[PDB]
Amino acid sequence: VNSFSGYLKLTDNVYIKNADIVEEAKKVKPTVVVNAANVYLKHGGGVAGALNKATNNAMQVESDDYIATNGPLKVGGSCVLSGHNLAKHCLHVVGPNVNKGEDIQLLKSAYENFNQHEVLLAPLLSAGIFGADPIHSLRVCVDTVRTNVYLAVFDKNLYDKLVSSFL
Numbered sequence: 001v002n003s004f005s006g007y008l009k010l011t012d013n014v015y016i017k018n019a020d021i022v023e024e025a026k027k028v029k030p031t032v033v034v035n036a037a038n039v040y041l042k043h044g045g046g047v048a049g050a051l052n053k054a055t056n057n058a059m060q061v062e063s064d065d066y067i068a069t070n071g072p073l074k075v076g077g078s079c080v081l082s083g084h085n086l087a088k089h090c091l092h093v094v095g096p097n098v099n100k101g102e103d104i105q106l107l108k109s110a111y112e113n114f115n116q117h118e119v120l121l122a123p124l125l126s127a128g129i130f131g132a133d134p135i136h137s138l139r140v141c142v143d144t145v146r147t148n149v150y151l152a153v154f155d156k157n158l159y160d161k162l163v164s165s166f167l
C-alpha cells in the first residue's frame, strides 16, 4: 500500500492521473519523482522548468555541479539527484526530443531507467515540448516499465484521450 490517490489502473504496474506533477510531488513526497530532462540538465521549460521552479532553482544549481563534474547525459540515459522539497530523489531521464531529430527508438531505453526503482511518480517521457506522440509514449511505458509507475498527465484533454484510446 502506498499514498498515491485517485489514479486509474491501466495494468498490473502502471497507473495514470490527470494531475500537475509538481503538486502531486508536493503532496505525496514520493521516494522518486522523474524529471523530463535534457542531456545538459538545463531545466528551462516543460516538466523540468516546472519542477525546478518549485525547488526555487536548487535543482538547477545541483544539476550544474553534476554536469561540471560528469559531463552531459546520454539520450536515453539518466542520473539520480536530490528530490529537494518534492521527493527523496529525482531521477532525471532523457527521452529523445523529436524537435531535435533524435531517434524515437531511444524512448524504450529511456523508460528502462525506471526499472531501477520500485515505485516512481513520472510524466510521459518525450511528450509535451519533446514532440513525441503521448499515446506512443504511454504504450512504450506499459511495455517497458515493470516497476510501479504513477503517471501524471497535466492536460485534462490529453488524459481523457490517453485513457479512452488505451489498449
Ligand SMILES: O=C(NC[C@@]1(O)CCN(C(=O)c2cnc3[nH]ccc3c2)C1)c1cccc(C2CC2)n1
Pocket (backbone or CB within 6 Å): 019, 020, 021, 022, 036, 046, 047, 050, 051, 123, 124, 125, 126, 127, 128, 129, 130, 131, 132, 133, 134, 152, 153, 154, 155, 158
Ligand atoms: O506536457 C506535454 N508533453 C511533455 C511530457 O512528455 C513531459 C511532461 N509531460 C506532462 O504531461 C506534464 C506533467 N506535469 C507537469 N507539471 C508541469 C508541467 C507538466 C507536464 C508529458 C503535453 C501537454 C499538452 C499536450 C501535449 C501533446 C502535444 C503532445 N503534450
